Design an enzyme around this catalytic site. Structure first.
Site, mmCIF file in Angstrom:
data_model
loop_
_atom_site.group_PDB
_atom_site.id
_atom_site.type_symbol
_atom_site.label_atom_id
_atom_site.label_comp_id
_atom_site.label_asym_id
_atom_site.label_seq_id
_atom_site.Cartn_x
_atom_site.Cartn_y
_atom_site.Cartn_z
ATOM 1 C CB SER A 137 -1.424 13.947 -13.933
ATOM 2 O OG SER A 137 -1.853 13.715 -15.263
ATOM 3 C CG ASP B 143 -1.790 1.050 1.329
ATOM 4 O OD1 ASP B 143 -1.867 1.993 0.389
ATOM 5 O OD2 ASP B 143 -2.428 1.267 2.390
#
Length: 330
Positions: free
Chosen positions: A199, A35
């Site tokens: 992004s 994780d």
């Protein structure tokens, strides 16, 4: 040193991935959910409330000659999806894919919430975010990666998740045969303890690329891709009959649809998520309404590049003094 371990989807939808981890002496092998969105290594154990264990493999520290209770230490974690767990702490030897850490904090669950009990395939979590998020009190503990880093050939790990197939987590090296083209690296902010990056934009299907900064986290522990409502609406508008359902909890679409791809930017590079990766199947058995793999992050407070996005790429988690993230097509 290096390590290399195969990671396997827990079900036919790729809802999560499990990786075998050896704990203790002799080894007790537990299948953990790696994780990158949290920083605790916790396990079902001989201390877990019996009614909250349903098929998981448990760690029994009394059977490990190298286990030591970390006196006074407790932990308690609440995840972004509402799940939680808590307990006490041992140190023990932990190995992943041939890479061994001695004295790793192994957080033994006394209590787990219902979604953990109901996932018989997940024996615990192995956190790979920054150690500043670790919940052990009164002495915060280091992640497996932080403990291994100094010994690794290079201070990196990579995630190569499969679509409806196994993949790989590597520690300490970058397998140059595992991706195509080049790896594009991008800056990371560690201010919230996550692998947080920006992004450079997106495209829907064969449409034009929209240049726009989208801050979010690379989270292997989240199944889906959570993005701003504007982006998500633009995607689902290209699927006839798709709609956001308040009763179901997100965008659904007709199971008869063919889904368009979704592209996200990493610097000047582009990662393409095939349409099939965005299909999470019937909302309930036998339904012709299917659940979408791209959902709005409105109300979550952060955008999340979960497994839907990450499994379209070979992803480098570079834990150098100034961390960075790398993405390649594969």
């Amino acid at each position: 040193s290096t390590g290399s371990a195969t990671t396997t989807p827990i079900d036919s939808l790729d809802d999560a991935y499990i990786t075998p981890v050896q704990i203790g002496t002799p080894a007790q092998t537990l299948n953990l959910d790696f994780d990158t969105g949290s920083s605790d290594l916790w396990v079902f154990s001989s201390e877990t409330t019996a009614s909250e264990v349903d098929g998981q493999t448990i760690y029994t520290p009394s059977k490990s000659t190298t286990a030591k209770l970390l006196s006074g230490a407790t932990w308690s974690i609440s995840y972004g999806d509402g799940s939680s767990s808590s307990g006490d702490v041992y140190t023990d030897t932990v190995s992943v894919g041939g890479l061994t850490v001695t004295g790793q904090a192994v957080e033994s669950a006394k209590k787990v919430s219902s979604s953990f009990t109901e996932d018989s395939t997940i024996d615990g979590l192995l956190g790979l975010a920054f150690s500043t998020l670790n919940t052990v009190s009164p002495t915060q503990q280091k992640t497996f990666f932080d403990n291994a880093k100094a010994s690794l050939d290079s201070p990196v790990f990579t995630a190569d998740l499969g679509y409806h197939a196994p993949g790989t987590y590597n520690f300490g090296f970058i397998d140059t045969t595992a991706y195509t083209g080049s790896i594009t690296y991008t800056a990371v902010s560690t201010k919230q303890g996550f692998w947080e990056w920006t992004s450079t934009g997106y495209a829907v299907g064969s449409g034009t690329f929209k240049s726009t900064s989208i801050d979010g986290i690379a989270d292997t522990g989240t199944t889906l891709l959570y993005l701003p409502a504007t982006v998500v609406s633009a995607y689902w508008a290209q699927v006839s009959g798709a709609k956001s359902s308040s009763s179901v909890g997100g965008y659904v679409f007709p199971c008869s649809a063919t889904l368009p791809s979704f592209t996200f930017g990493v610097g000047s590079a582009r990662i393409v998520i095939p349409g099939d990766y965005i299909d999470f199947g019937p909302i309930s058995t036998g339904s012709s309404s299917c659940f979408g793999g791209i959902q709005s992050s409105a109300g979550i407070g952060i955008n999340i590049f979960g497994d839907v996005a990450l499994k379209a790429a070979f992803v480098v988690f570079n834990g150098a003094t100034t961390p960075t993230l790398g993405f390649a097509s594969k």
